């Protein structure tokens, strides 16, 4: 029996190029020996990190993205986009009484093999002059709102690929377009993508990672 820390090594984690940062943190992997590869045992790791950390701005503190470590390059692991979510505190704060919440979902496909199930949630809003405290929308209007969200998602995601998906989720263009399209219906507020899930993956993009990386 010896110290278990003598068989451990520290490696850096590199977020994909879609973000504004390069160094995210350090990981821990056991000593590389025979019949057991650190590369083999590393590719099945999942990281969670804040979008505020990735963008160096507190404008996305509530958003948290997950990364999947895939490739190792010079003792510096490279990760890829695996999904985004919203913090429990933000979700509970957004959920309120005496208002109507509409949540919808849709599955989207990129130019390459990528299946992404993206969700969206939006809440009704007052008009700064309303006297009543109900602020409720009829189920027909909810269905019309869901159709408007479906149309907006399809139109904005018809041909983007993952690069444009990340480039358009940070500025929150999906929620803005949904609110714009919902002008003829209840004004709606706090429309955002609550969670994006990844169902299919390409063939590891073993060469496209080299294409994207290699800069700085």
């Amino acid at each position: 029996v010896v110290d278990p820390f003598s068989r451990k090594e520290w490696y850096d984690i590199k977020a994909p190029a879609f973000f504004e940062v390069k160094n995210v943190g350090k990981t821990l992997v056991n000593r590389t020996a025979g019949l057991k590869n650190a590369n083999d045992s590393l590719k099945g790791r999942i990281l969670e990190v804040s979008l505020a950390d990735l963008q160096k701005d507190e404008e996305h503190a509530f958003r948290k993205v997950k990364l999947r470590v895939e490739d190792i390059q010079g003792k510096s692991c490279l990760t890829s986009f695996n999904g985004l979510s919203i913090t429990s505190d933000k979700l509970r704060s957004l959920v309120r009484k005496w208002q109507t919440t509409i949540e919808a979902d849709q599955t989207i496909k990129t130019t390459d093999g990528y299946l992404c199930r993206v969700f969206v949630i939006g809440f009704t809003r007052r008009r700064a002059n309303q006297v009543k405290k109900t602020t409720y929308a009829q189920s027909s209007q909810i269905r019309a709102i869901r159709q408007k969200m479906f149309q907006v998602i399809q139109n904005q995601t018809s041909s983007c690929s993952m690069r444009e998906l990340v480039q358009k989720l940070i500025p929150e263009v999906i929620g803005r377009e949904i609110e714009r399209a919902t002008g003829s219906i209840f004004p709606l507020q706090n429309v955002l993508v609550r969670k994006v899930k990844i169902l299919k993956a390409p063939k590891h993009d073993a060469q496209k990672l080299l294409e994207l990386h290699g800069e700085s």
């Binding site: 820390f5 995210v24 350090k26 821990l28 999942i46 990281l47 470590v69 429990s88």
Partner: protein, 128 residues
């Protein structure tokens, strides 16, 4: 940028508190200490004093490696249960803060259900 960030999970149950500290990833953890190995009375496992003792022991063992900042994540029993963190959650947070180790990104990750299965008790409930 000479700081190293880990992930500190806190499981604040009403019977015993878990102070688990891992790296930024999930696997290959470093430290895991609860109140059971800090108090041997089988009653004060969830006590704030035992939680702070486990938290400070975790801090010492983490400083042994040389890790500076931790992303904290507290969580209750969750699921179809009380879903409220125990008294040891705040005690562990204060103990980590007082030990000198940096704290960042506080979040609650208790598992909530979307109307999950039936809770035990038998309709009438635990008539204690």
């Amino acid at each position: 940028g000479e700081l190293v960030f880990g992930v500190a999970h806190i499981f604040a149950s009403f019977n015993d508190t878990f102070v688990h500290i891992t790296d930024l990833t999930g696997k290959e953890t470093i430290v895991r200490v609860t109140g059971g190995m800090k108090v041997k009375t089988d009653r004060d496992e969830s006590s704030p004093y035992a939680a702070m003792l486990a938290a400070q022991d975790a801090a010492a063992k983490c400083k042994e490696v040389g890790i500076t900042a931790l992303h904290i994540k507290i969580r209750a029993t969750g699921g179809t249960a009380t879903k409220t963190p125990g008294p040891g959650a705040q005690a562990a947070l204060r103990a980590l803060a007082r030990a000198g180790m940096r704290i960042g990104r506080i979040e609650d990750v208790t598992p909530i259900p979307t109307d999950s299965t039936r809770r035990k008790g038998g309709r009438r409930g635990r008539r204690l």
